[PDB]
Amino acid sequence: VNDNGPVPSPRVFTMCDQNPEPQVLTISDADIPPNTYPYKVSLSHGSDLTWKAELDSKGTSMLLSPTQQLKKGDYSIYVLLSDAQNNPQLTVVNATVCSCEGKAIKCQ
């Protein structure tokens, strides 16, 4: 039966300041195929606190990148996927930012 729905791999980032590079994130389903066939990524209240969604070509991961030069640490991003649809709701995959240039660094 297709019970569960899609979910992001890492739940906490360490973005950088000056020019953060894409925060790689992926997807996982508890179901058995077809039930986990391809997706549809969606961003809920903050679909713009600047956050822009993306899929890897070979299916599984998603590319998460801002679109604003935003602030000094601690804040989430509401995520939302689907697989037959099922639609999950995912959620918050918070984001810890600390001073910088462009590579995902160890934080503070």
Residues lying near ligand NAG in the complex (CB under 6 A): 74, 76, 91-92, 94, 96
Residue nearest to ligand NAG (CB): 74
Cis peptide before 34 (omega within 30 of 0): yes
* Nearest distance from C-beta of residue 35 to ligand NAG, angstroms: 25
Q: Decide whether 56 or 74 has the Cβ nearer to ligand NAG.
A: 74
Selected from 31, 53, 63, 70, the binder of Ca ion by CB under 5 A is 31
Q: Which of Ca ion, ligand NAG, none does residue 29 bind to, with CB < 5 to 8 Å depending on kind?
A: Ca ion
